[PDB]
Amino acid sequence: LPNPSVPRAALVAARFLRPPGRFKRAELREHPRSKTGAFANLVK
Amino acid sequence: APSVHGDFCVVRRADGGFHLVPPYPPRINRTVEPYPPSAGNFYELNRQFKLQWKNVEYQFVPKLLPRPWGRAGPWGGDLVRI
Amino acid sequence: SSLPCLLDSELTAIFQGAAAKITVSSNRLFKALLQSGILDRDLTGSRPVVEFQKLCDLYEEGRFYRTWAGGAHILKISGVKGLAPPGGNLKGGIIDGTPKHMSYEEFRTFVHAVRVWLRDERSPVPLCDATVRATGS
Amino acid sequence: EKEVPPPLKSGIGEPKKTGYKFPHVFFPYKSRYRSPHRQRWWPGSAPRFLLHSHPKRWAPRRDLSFAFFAFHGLKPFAEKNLYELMHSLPLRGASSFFWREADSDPWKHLGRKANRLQARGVRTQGRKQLVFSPREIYYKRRPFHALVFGRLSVGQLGASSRVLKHPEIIRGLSRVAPPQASLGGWKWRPPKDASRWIFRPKFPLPFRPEL
Amino acid sequence: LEGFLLSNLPPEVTNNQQLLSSLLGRAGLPVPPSASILLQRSRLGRTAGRCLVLLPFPSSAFLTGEDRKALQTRLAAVLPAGSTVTACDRNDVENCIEEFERYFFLTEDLQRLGVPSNLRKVVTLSPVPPTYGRREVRDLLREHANVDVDPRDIVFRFRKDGVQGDTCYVLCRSERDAGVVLARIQETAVPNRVHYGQLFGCSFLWASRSALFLCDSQLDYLPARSPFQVFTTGWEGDVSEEEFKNLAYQLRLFPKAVRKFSHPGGEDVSSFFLEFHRMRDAKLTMSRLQLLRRRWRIGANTPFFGFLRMADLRFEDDVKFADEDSAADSDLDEPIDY
RNA sequence: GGCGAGAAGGGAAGUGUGUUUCAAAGAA
RNA sequence: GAAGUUAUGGUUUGAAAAAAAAA
RNA sequence: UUUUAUGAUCCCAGGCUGGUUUAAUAAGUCAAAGUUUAGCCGGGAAG
RNA sequence: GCUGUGAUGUUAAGGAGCAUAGGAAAUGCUACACACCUUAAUUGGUAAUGCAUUGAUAAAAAAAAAAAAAAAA
RNA sequence: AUCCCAGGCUGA
RNA sequence: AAGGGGAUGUUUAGCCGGGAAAAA
């Protein structure tokens, strides 16, 4: 139910960050998935 | 009040940073047939998106909700633990 | 003193009794929960009996209908006509008033919330709404 | 005939992979999408390290031999990486000094983008390089994969080709993985206090190399 | 029920003793010319806007939920709009008193943390639930990391309204202990409150190195030199400013200026403050430093670099605090990009 | 290794789309 | 993000559900 | 118990919005509704 | 030593060409601008873009020395 | 469950 | 060349996190 935990500092610092486009979104869900961070598994 | 980030979420990155990602599982409109009609030749038309950690699973399929949507948003689901 | 937590075995027994994966109407769940007298035992451990009216008020105030997508069936049945609230479409229409059919985990969360709120109603220091904004000046 | 990406292959030291039945995640509805993990196969590009470099090598047993297993150590200068160079050196290259040239990288010479406008102009015409001395070595896949640490400092190249002169002009970092060890043109120099037992001098050549 | 916490009191009420006492008396609490009042004041003798009212407790020990409701409603009605009233039990009273003490003595604690020798021993924990104190942080570290730290070198970050922030700085007794804390405390579930004899609410704590402290006479006016300054450490001991300029150029780091920092003792590592022309250049250099960290394989939590920033200063003669001055225009030094 | 990348969509939706009138704070 | 927002053409062929009862 | 001649139940067809000049005592906003670079919007999938 | 095996399933929601139906619904470019992407940088790049052909469905194609202004009495 | 991790911590 | 062409030579073990395949 909840989203992955992230600091309020990151929440604030991402204020002007443009969200991903179509191709950039497609690059985040490929199988090599090298970009996934710590404690950031979509399924788990 | 509206949300600053909308439907995307800030999540940690493999390089020690952070970035915005779309929600999981995907918010899909299942009331309509897949488009194009030949989408099945290249995709799994009954693909499912699970939320399981070890032996515990959760059944969550986002779906549209009645208005006013407000802060919560258009999409929601039930609490179903296995 | 203390607030003991109910047993998953007892809650599952109540849930299955009300039913007789598995979703049971809030009406049946509330009736079974009130018959079991479990809330009365909790209150005695921590004056009158809990009412179906009190259960309905707590359900509404907790607003679990919105939280657990209780209105998705409206869009399933009516369709686009289900988006607008009553009166949004000046032509009129029928909007199902079915209360949510809770699963076991949803029922457990509701029961825990009800017990906590009932405890707070009497405890000198509550878990929730311990802070109230001043209005006068 | 058409030039197309080579088939995907698994690296040495790994189990096989099942693969996928279509090139990328948008095929064919978005033909101009490029995956970040796509293999770089076109001329003037360096294949990714441990993903598409060092593919599993298979040959018919008729042609198999012991030399077949020295391919990674015999890779040419432009391609051989730091670990492949180090494996067959005294003390696994430890206590020596290493520096990379970069003047023969494949992109600087080959490809469609090799010749392009630069912010400074075209070339018409001694150097302070980065020197790495290994201290801790551990190979995960001999000879091309290792987890190395060592001292990084600022050296002083000079006219012999170039030769390292003062490997320790400025002290840098005392323990770091080698920089650009994944690939490139590396040159090495044995330490000043070298022992003839470890760094064996060349065996004398025959006086009469009879046929 | 031990007392009430009043937050966001107006400066007039906080400063005027008679007005607050009269308000409490009208609400019902008899304030002697019994209930006791304690304001939150800093070392400058300025009220932070928070008050603690401890009820008389040879008799209030028999109060009940109805009494709590009535008293809280009366206090909310009497007190000015915009100020919140909360009920506090004994644990809440202890937390409030400790919070006031730490707020008053924050400066000395900050200096002690900033002693240069402790550069690599301070660990930042967030988000700490408000109910937690130094003892709770010590217990949490013992439980989830098997590390023992002094419960007197733990410093909470405070907010402009006097309420504790969700960030703690802990001075581990050793760099090994700091590294162990960093490795162990990651997404650790932690109870939020103890109520009715159970643990209610879960908060997921993380540890990192995101607030480095340095208190020295050589750096007091260093930050004023430029707004775009990057601290870096972990270099060899004997390198001077010119040698480090050459090394940075070799590493493809292009600082406008370099300033070496040296403190009595500890010459094994040399620290340097780099200065850049633009915030864009500072950020790109920090990104390259992150890349070099990853390629060099040093610890992700190892203290390698950071962004210099003087701590906010408050002076007795100031009428408007610089941090609270709405006219500031420092944001024009940091252009926004998508 | 890092950023950007929808042949610039008319394939869904009628009380919908959009329009008009408003509102939206970090460093709490 | 919220609150208000006349329907039109195809001529249209007024009651629809729930509940109760039934077996 | 909830909708319903203020059109419920229930078919088919259509995204909406703006564009300055504009003769005649018909204009001080082109005056019930006619647009043309544009504005807002228009799912998801390598399992 | 002697078949083969090692991720070895690749082309439409787009474009172009050719036909069908219809009264009819579309063609060339070396393109020094703007804008955008990138960068440490007027550091590098484009074909969205900008030009030209036809189309016959629109304009301009009258008046002022020293001025580029001037209800041109 | 042990294939990978230029991801980490621990063992008196 | 009696006698160094001798002798010594089992695999570090856990926890967390991320990724791929099989399965689901």
JSON list of C-alpha atoms in Angstrom, two decimals, chain D residues 9-120:
[
{"chain": "D", "resi": 9, "resn": "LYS", "atom": "CA", "xyz": [25.24, -13.56, -25.85]},
{"chain": "D", "resi": 10, "resn": "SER", "atom": "CA", "xyz": [26.00, -14.38, -22.23]},
{"chain": "D", "resi": 11, "resn": "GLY", "atom": "CA", "xyz": [29.34, -13.64, -20.63]},
{"chain": "D", "resi": 12, "resn": "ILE", "atom": "CA", "xyz": [31.99, -16.09, -19.51]},
{"chain": "D", "resi": 13, "resn": "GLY", "atom": "CA", "xyz": [31.33, -17.30, -15.99]},
{"chain": "D", "resi": 14, "resn": "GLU", "atom": "CA", "xyz": [27.52, -17.13, -16.09]},
{"chain": "D", "resi": 15, "resn": "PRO", "atom": "CA", "xyz": [24.64, -19.50, -16.86]},
{"chain": "D", "resi": 16, "resn": "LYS", "atom": "CA", "xyz": [22.72, -19.14, -20.09]},
{"chain": "D", "resi": 17, "resn": "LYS", "atom": "CA", "xyz": [19.87, -16.68, -20.53]},
{"chain": "D", "resi": 18, "resn": "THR", "atom": "CA", "xyz": [16.48, -17.38, -22.08]},
{"chain": "D", "resi": 19, "resn": "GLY", "atom": "CA", "xyz": [16.26, -14.09, -23.96]},
{"chain": "D", "resi": 20, "resn": "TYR", "atom": "CA", "xyz": [13.30, -12.20, -25.35]},
{"chain": "D", "resi": 21, "resn": "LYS", "atom": "CA", "xyz": [11.31, -12.67, -28.54]},
{"chain": "D", "resi": 22, "resn": "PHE", "atom": "CA", "xyz": [11.37, -9.00, -29.64]},
{"chain": "D", "resi": 23, "resn": "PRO", "atom": "CA", "xyz": [14.27, -6.50, -29.64]},
{"chain": "D", "resi": 24, "resn": "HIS", "atom": "CA", "xyz": [13.07, -3.85, -27.17]},
{"chain": "D", "resi": 25, "resn": "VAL", "atom": "CA", "xyz": [10.12, -2.88, -24.98]},
{"chain": "D", "resi": 26, "resn": "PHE", "atom": "CA", "xyz": [8.37, -0.85, -27.71]},
{"chain": "D", "resi": 27, "resn": "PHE", "atom": "CA", "xyz": [8.91, -3.07, -30.75]},
{"chain": "D", "resi": 28, "resn": "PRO", "atom": "CA", "xyz": [7.53, -2.38, -33.36]},
{"chain": "D", "resi": 29, "resn": "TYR", "atom": "CA", "xyz": [5.22, 0.52, -32.44]},
{"chain": "D", "resi": 30, "resn": "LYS", "atom": "CA", "xyz": [8.08, 2.96, -31.65]},
{"chain": "D", "resi": 31, "resn": "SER", "atom": "CA", "xyz": [10.87, 2.16, -34.10]},
{"chain": "D", "resi": 32, "resn": "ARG", "atom": "CA", "xyz": [13.22, 4.96, -32.96]},
{"chain": "D", "resi": 33, "resn": "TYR", "atom": "CA", "xyz": [13.38, 3.98, -29.28]},
{"chain": "D", "resi": 34, "resn": "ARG", "atom": "CA", "xyz": [16.87, 3.05, -28.07]},
{"chain": "D", "resi": 35, "resn": "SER", "atom": "CA", "xyz": [17.43, 1.06, -24.90]},
{"chain": "D", "resi": 36, "resn": "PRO", "atom": "CA", "xyz": [20.17, 2.26, -22.51]},
{"chain": "D", "resi": 37, "resn": "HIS", "atom": "CA", "xyz": [21.37, -1.35, -22.21]},
{"chain": "D", "resi": 38, "resn": "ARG", "atom": "CA", "xyz": [21.54, -1.96, -25.97]},
{"chain": "D", "resi": 39, "resn": "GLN", "atom": "CA", "xyz": [24.80, -3.56, -27.07]},
{"chain": "D", "resi": 40, "resn": "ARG", "atom": "CA", "xyz": [27.25, -1.18, -28.75]},
{"chain": "D", "resi": 41, "resn": "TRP", "atom": "CA", "xyz": [28.27, -3.11, -31.87]},
{"chain": "D", "resi": 42, "resn": "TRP", "atom": "CA", "xyz": [28.83, -0.36, -34.44]},
{"chain": "D", "resi": 43, "resn": "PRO", "atom": "CA", "xyz": [32.43, 0.59, -35.29]},
{"chain": "D", "resi": 44, "resn": "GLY", "atom": "CA", "xyz": [33.99, 3.15, -32.99]},
{"chain": "D", "resi": 45, "resn": "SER", "atom": "CA", "xyz": [32.23, 1.87, -29.85]},
{"chain": "D", "resi": 46, "resn": "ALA", "atom": "CA", "xyz": [33.43, -0.09, -26.84]},
{"chain": "D", "resi": 47, "resn": "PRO", "atom": "CA", "xyz": [31.24, -3.03, -25.76]},
{"chain": "D", "resi": 48, "resn": "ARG", "atom": "CA", "xyz": [29.88, -2.81, -22.24]},
{"chain": "D", "resi": 49, "resn": "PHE", "atom": "CA", "xyz": [31.96, -4.43, -19.51]},
{"chain": "D", "resi": 50, "resn": "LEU", "atom": "CA", "xyz": [30.66, -7.79, -18.20]},
{"chain": "D", "resi": 51, "resn": "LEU", "atom": "CA", "xyz": [27.40, -7.39, -20.17]},
{"chain": "D", "resi": 52, "resn": "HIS", "atom": "CA", "xyz": [28.38, -7.78, -23.83]},
{"chain": "D", "resi": 53, "resn": "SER", "atom": "CA", "xyz": [32.18, -8.03, -23.62]},
{"chain": "D", "resi": 54, "resn": "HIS", "atom": "CA", "xyz": [33.85, -11.38, -23.02]},
{"chain": "D", "resi": 55, "resn": "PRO", "atom": "CA", "xyz": [31.14, -13.58, -24.57]},
{"chain": "D", "resi": 56, "resn": "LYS", "atom": "CA", "xyz": [31.13, -17.32, -23.98]},
{"chain": "D", "resi": 57, "resn": "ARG", "atom": "CA", "xyz": [33.68, -18.84, -26.35]},
{"chain": "D", "resi": 58, "resn": "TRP", "atom": "CA", "xyz": [32.83, -22.13, -28.07]},
{"chain": "D", "resi": 59, "resn": "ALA", "atom": "CA", "xyz": [34.92, -23.96, -30.65]},
{"chain": "D", "resi": 60, "resn": "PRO", "atom": "CA", "xyz": [34.78, -27.49, -32.08]},
{"chain": "D", "resi": 61, "resn": "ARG", "atom": "CA", "xyz": [36.95, -29.87, -30.09]},
{"chain": "D", "resi": 62, "resn": "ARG", "atom": "CA", "xyz": [38.99, -30.55, -33.23]},
{"chain": "D", "resi": 63, "resn": "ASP", "atom": "CA", "xyz": [40.51, -27.06, -32.98]},
{"chain": "D", "resi": 64, "resn": "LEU", "atom": "CA", "xyz": [40.59, -26.80, -29.18]},
{"chain": "D", "resi": 65, "resn": "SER", "atom": "CA", "xyz": [44.02, -26.47, -27.57]},
{"chain": "D", "resi": 66, "resn": "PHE", "atom": "CA", "xyz": [45.70, -24.89, -24.56]},
{"chain": "D", "resi": 67, "resn": "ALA", "atom": "CA", "xyz": [46.44, -21.69, -26.49]},
{"chain": "D", "resi": 68, "resn": "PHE", "atom": "CA", "xyz": [42.66, -21.32, -26.90]},
{"chain": "D", "resi": 69, "resn": "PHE", "atom": "CA", "xyz": [42.47, -20.29, -23.23]},
{"chain": "D", "resi": 70, "resn": "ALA", "atom": "CA", "xyz": [45.06, -17.47, -23.49]},
{"chain": "D", "resi": 71, "resn": "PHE", "atom": "CA", "xyz": [42.88, -15.29, -25.75]},
{"chain": "D", "resi": 72, "resn": "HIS", "atom": "CA", "xyz": [42.04, -12.71, -23.08]},
{"chain": "D", "resi": 73, "resn": "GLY", "atom": "CA", "xyz": [45.69, -12.34, -22.08]},
{"chain": "D", "resi": 74, "resn": "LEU", "atom": "CA", "xyz": [46.76, -12.17, -25.73]},
{"chain": "D", "resi": 75, "resn": "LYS", "atom": "CA", "xyz": [44.25, -9.46, -26.67]},
{"chain": "D", "resi": 76, "resn": "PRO", "atom": "CA", "xyz": [46.06, -6.63, -28.53]},
{"chain": "D", "resi": 77, "resn": "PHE", "atom": "CA", "xyz": [47.25, -3.41, -26.91]},
{"chain": "D", "resi": 78, "resn": "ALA", "atom": "CA", "xyz": [44.24, -1.28, -27.86]},
{"chain": "D", "resi": 79, "resn": "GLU", "atom": "CA", "xyz": [41.80, -3.88, -26.48]},
{"chain": "D", "resi": 80, "resn": "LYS", "atom": "CA", "xyz": [43.64, -5.56, -23.59]},
{"chain": "D", "resi": 81, "resn": "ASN", "atom": "CA", "xyz": [42.47, -4.23, -20.23]},
{"chain": "D", "resi": 82, "resn": "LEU", "atom": "CA", "xyz": [44.32, -3.68, -16.97]},
{"chain": "D", "resi": 83, "resn": "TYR", "atom": "CA", "xyz": [43.34, -7.01, -15.41]},
{"chain": "D", "resi": 84, "resn": "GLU", "atom": "CA", "xyz": [44.35, -8.99, -18.50]},
{"chain": "D", "resi": 85, "resn": "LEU", "atom": "CA", "xyz": [47.69, -7.16, -18.53]},
{"chain": "D", "resi": 86, "resn": "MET", "atom": "CA", "xyz": [48.23, -7.73, -14.81]},
{"chain": "D", "resi": 87, "resn": "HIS", "atom": "CA", "xyz": [47.39, -11.44, -14.66]},
{"chain": "D", "resi": 88, "resn": "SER", "atom": "CA", "xyz": [50.62, -12.58, -16.36]},
{"chain": "D", "resi": 89, "resn": "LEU", "atom": "CA", "xyz": [52.96, -10.12, -14.62]},
{"chain": "D", "resi": 90, "resn": "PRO", "atom": "CA", "xyz": [55.31, -10.66, -11.65]},
{"chain": "D", "resi": 91, "resn": "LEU", "atom": "CA", "xyz": [53.32, -10.62, -8.41]},
{"chain": "D", "resi": 92, "resn": "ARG", "atom": "CA", "xyz": [50.22, -10.17, -10.59]},
{"chain": "D", "resi": 93, "resn": "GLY", "atom": "CA", "xyz": [51.57, -6.74, -11.52]},
{"chain": "D", "resi": 94, "resn": "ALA", "atom": "CA", "xyz": [51.57, -5.61, -7.89]},
{"chain": "D", "resi": 95, "resn": "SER", "atom": "CA", "xyz": [54.20, -3.14, -6.63]},
{"chain": "D", "resi": 96, "resn": "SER", "atom": "CA", "xyz": [54.59, -1.89, -10.23]},
{"chain": "D", "resi": 97, "resn": "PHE", "atom": "CA", "xyz": [53.22, 1.30, -11.78]},
{"chain": "D", "resi": 98, "resn": "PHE", "atom": "CA", "xyz": [50.50, 1.51, -14.43]},
{"chain": "D", "resi": 99, "resn": "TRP", "atom": "CA", "xyz": [49.21, 4.35, -16.61]},
{"chain": "D", "resi": 100, "resn": "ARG", "atom": "CA", "xyz": [46.80, 4.52, -19.54]},
{"chain": "D", "resi": 101, "resn": "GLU", "atom": "CA", "xyz": [47.47, 6.33, -22.82]},
{"chain": "D", "resi": 102, "resn": "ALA", "atom": "CA", "xyz": [44.01, 6.68, -24.46]},
{"chain": "D", "resi": 103, "resn": "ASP", "atom": "CA", "xyz": [45.59, 7.75, -27.77]},
{"chain": "D", "resi": 104, "resn": "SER", "atom": "CA", "xyz": [44.47, 4.53, -29.52]},
{"chain": "D", "resi": 105, "resn": "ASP", "atom": "CA", "xyz": [40.88, 4.21, -28.30]},
{"chain": "D", "resi": 106, "resn": "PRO", "atom": "CA", "xyz": [38.62, 2.85, -31.06]},
{"chain": "D", "resi": 107, "resn": "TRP", "atom": "CA", "xyz": [36.29, 5.86, -31.09]},
{"chain": "D", "resi": 108, "resn": "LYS", "atom": "CA", "xyz": [39.13, 8.34, -31.65]},
{"chain": "D", "resi": 109, "resn": "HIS", "atom": "CA", "xyz": [40.01, 6.60, -34.94]},
{"chain": "D", "resi": 110, "resn": "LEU", "atom": "CA", "xyz": [37.02, 4.66, -36.32]},
{"chain": "D", "resi": 111, "resn": "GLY", "atom": "CA", "xyz": [33.33, 5.34, -36.81]},
{"chain": "D", "resi": 112, "resn": "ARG", "atom": "CA", "xyz": [31.13, 7.96, -38.43]},
{"chain": "D", "resi": 113, "resn": "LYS", "atom": "CA", "xyz": [31.58, 10.33, -35.47]},
{"chain": "D", "resi": 114, "resn": "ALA", "atom": "CA", "xyz": [35.38, 10.02, -35.33]},
{"chain": "D", "resi": 115, "resn": "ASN", "atom": "CA", "xyz": [35.92, 13.28, -37.25]},
{"chain": "D", "resi": 116, "resn": "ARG", "atom": "CA", "xyz": [33.75, 16.06, -35.81]},
{"chain": "D", "resi": 117, "resn": "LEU", "atom": "CA", "xyz": [34.05, 19.67, -34.73]},
{"chain": "D", "resi": 118, "resn": "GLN", "atom": "CA", "xyz": [35.86, 20.17, -31.43]},
{"chain": "D", "resi": 119, "resn": "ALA", "atom": "CA", "xyz": [35.70, 23.16, -29.11]},
{"chain": "D", "resi": 120, "resn": "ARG", "atom": "CA", "xyz": [39.41, 23.88, -29.63]}
]
